[PDB]
Write a protein that binds this ligand. Structure first.
Ligand SMILES: Nc1nc2c(ncn2[C@@H]2O[C@H](CO)[C@@H](OP(=O)(O)O)[C@H]2O)c(=O)[nH]1
Ligand SMILES: [Ca+2]
Length: 104
């Protein structure tokens, strides 16, 4: 069973922890990857009820199982905070335009 289901993509907790660790490391070092500069601030315009405090940062999680290193980020993202706490896993899949919905 999937711990997080983003559309058709299936992710386990280990998939999320691995992606999160990479994104947080880049955040700490003040570095970014890709043309859209990840990781970067996630403003939460959607208004999700996150259990952890802001600021939030978004980082791509890939269905391939690889850690994001540039190029197309796909539709899925892990959102973490300043303390490297997982806020949640969100996706563009099933959401209009560039909006997000939570992965179930
Ligand atoms: N939908 C949405 N996009 C946000 C939010 N905060 C920042 N963004 C950025 O706005 C764009 C929406 O897809 C993305 O930028 P990016 O294109 O540079 O990755 C996304 O990272 C937010 O709260 N909601
Ligand atoms: Ca996996």
């Amino acid at each position: 069973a999937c711990d997080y289901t983003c559309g058709s993509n299936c992710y386990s907790s280990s998939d999320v922890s691995t992606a999160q660790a990479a994104g947080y490391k880049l955040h700490e070092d003040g570095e970014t990857v890709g043309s859209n500069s990840y990781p970067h601030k996630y403003n939460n315009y959607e208004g999700f009820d996150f259990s952890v405090s802001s600021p939030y940062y978004e980082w791509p999680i890939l269905s391939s199982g690889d850690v994001y290193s540039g190029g197309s980020p796909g539709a899925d993202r892990v959102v973490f905070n300043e303390n490297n706490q997982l806020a949640g896993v969100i996706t563009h899949t099933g959401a209009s335009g560039n909006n997000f919905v939570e992965c179930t």
